Structures are given as structure tokens and as C-alpha cells.
Design a protein around this nucleic acid. Structure first.
Ligand SMILES: [Mg+2]
Ligand SMILES: [Mg+2]
Ligand SMILES: [Mg+2]
Ligand SMILES: [Mg+2]
Ligand SMILES: [Mg+2]
Ligand SMILES: [Mg+2]
Ligand SMILES: [Mg+2]
Ligand SMILES: [Mg+2]
Length: 213
DNA sequence: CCCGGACCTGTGACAAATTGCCCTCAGACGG
DNA sequence: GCCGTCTGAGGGCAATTTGTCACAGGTCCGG
């Protein structure tokens, strides 16, 4: 059925800041690259993007165009080593068609210890931080569909590049943790719960348990 | 001892960002 | 060779969500 995304854990655990629209495009690049027999040159069709994510052609065009120009200057850190995503601006040879030049030094980090999920699992998620959380949980999923993992809060803040006010724990709870656990439970086939680990007055880890519906 | 102080929690406000919608009009193609 | 239609590249919108901070209200420490 739907496209099966796979990626090296090094990408799941990398430090970067991307929007929802950019992350959506990134899944197709990883799919194109992996399906190959490099050049790092990928392509996106407006009308295909619209059908995949149930958008109109117009709003697809707006999403691709603005996503594409917001990649400029974005950088990726693997814990460390920093790379730019793109080494040339995007451009459109034909109407409804975009051509992009991914940094060929990124290829081995995409294909290597791996993470996998079908694209239908994530295509209704809205908050990009919630996409990051669902990817990290998939990294620990078992064949049958369950798993349990303890993630450190400081590592969450670094890897997902959360904004500065979420270093105050009550804001972390209200605007990130609760919201992203609610989307996953509402928008994916996963059912997720958690509990907090403490040391003194400080909360240090979050312990996630999940099963499949 | 009661205090001021250094931690922690959650909630009420407001500011800045993102969402799916809507409308226009020229490009690429076929009847 | 023109034209009606299917696209998609632009300009926008109000309704929600996300990002930030002041203040109320708990504990323990040391003086
Ligand atoms: Mg958009
Ligand atoms: Mg402490
Ligand atoms: Mg006593
Ligand atoms: Mg008093
Ligand atoms: Mg706008
Ligand atoms: Mg009261
Ligand atoms: Mg007080
Ligand atoms: Mg309290």
C-alpha cells in the first residue's frame, strides 16, 4: 500500500529545526534517494504532492514554494558535525515541477540501526515537534507494535531544538508534551501514555509506553 | 524561631505564527 | 489557428495554535 519510509537512526536523533511542510518534503527525498541504483538531485511534482496530503494544487504550490526558500541557511548536526541541507537553490524547469540539490555528503546519513514507518502514519500530524516524537518512538517499536523508552529532557530540548521558554518546565508540559501526545493519540494508529521521572525537585526524563491499535 | 530567598507548580494574558480558505489570471494542452 | 478548460503562481483573510511572561501559591533552607 502506502510508501514505506526508512531512515538511519542518525537522522531520527539529529539536531535540526524544520517546519511541517519541510518535513513532509524531506520524507519524499529520503524515499527517492533510497530507491536508487549519487547525484542527490531529487524532484517534486505539485499535483502529486497535493494528492498525497489531500491538498489543492494552489495550496500545494504555496507550501512547496515557501518551504523551499526557507531551507536556505538551515543546517544539520549529528552528534558533532554540521552540514547544510542544500548546496544550490531550488529551481523549476517546468510548470508544476521542482528540482532540488541535496548535499551529497548527507547521503550516507540517510542510508546506513534503523527507523521505519509508513507515510500514512504521519501525514495528518500538524505540529512538527510531534512528528519528531513519533519518529523517535518508532525507532524503538517492536514487530508486534509496542515499545517502551525513557528519553532525557535535555536531550529532547537539544535534538528537537525546542524554543527557549520551554526550559521552564510548566511551559514544556503545557505547549509541547501534552499537545504532541494528544495529536499522536488522535492522528496516528498508536496509543501513547507517559510518566515523569524525577530527581529531587527537578524532572529529568519522560518514560513513554505505547501499543498499536 | 518567622523571615526573605531560591526552588518548584499551574493559570490568565497577550503577541506572533500557522492553519485551511478564498479569489485572480496567465501557462500548457486538447477538442 | 483559436479557445475552454485544467493548473498553479500570485495576492490576500479570519479563526486557532504556538511562544512568552507576570503573578498566585506550595516546599525547604539558613539566619
Ligand atoms: Mg500553507
Ligand atoms: Mg534543585
Ligand atoms: Mg518544631
Ligand atoms: Mg506576614
Ligand atoms: Mg498570508
Ligand atoms: Mg486563592
Ligand atoms: Mg510566597
Ligand atoms: Mg505548587
Amino acid at each position: 500500500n502506502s510508501p514505506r519510509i526508512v531512515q538511519s537512526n542518525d537522522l531520527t536523533e539529529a539536531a535540526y529545526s524544520l517546519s511541517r511542510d519541510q518535513k513532509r518534503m524531506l520524507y519524499l527525498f529520503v524515499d527517492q534517494i533510497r530507491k536508487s541504483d549519487h547525484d542527490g538531485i531529487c524532484e517534486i511534482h505539485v499535483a502529486k504532492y497535493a494528492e498525497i496530503f489531500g491538498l489543492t494544487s494552489a495550496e500545494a504550490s504555496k507550501d512547496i514554494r515557501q518551504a523551499l526558500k526557507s531551507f536556505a541557511g538551515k543546517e544539520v548536526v549529528f552528534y558533532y558535525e554540521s552540514f547544510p541541507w542544500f548546496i544550490k537553490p531550488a529551481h523549476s524547469p517546468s510548470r508544476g515541477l521542482y528540482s532540488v540539490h541535496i548535499n551529497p555528503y548527507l547521503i550516507p546519513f540517510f542510508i546506513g540501526r534503523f527507523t521505519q514507518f509508513r507515510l500514512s502514519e504521519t501525514k495528518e500530524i500538524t505540529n512538527p515537534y510531534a512528528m519528531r516524537l513519533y519518529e523517535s518512538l518508532c525507532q524503538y517499536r517492536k514487530p508486534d507494535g509496542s515499545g517502551i523508552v525513557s528519553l532525557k529532557i535535555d536531550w529532547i530540548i537539544e535534538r528537537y531544538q525546542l524554543p527557549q521558554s520551554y526550559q521552564r518546565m510548566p511551559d514544556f508540559r503545557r505547549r509541547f508534551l501534552q499537545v504532541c501526545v494528544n495529536e499522536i493519540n488522535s492522528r496516528t494508529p498508536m496509543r501513547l501514555s507517559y510518566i515523569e521521572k524525577k530527581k529531587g525537585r527537578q524532572t529529568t526524563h519522560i518514560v513513554f509506553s505505547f501499543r498499536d491499535i
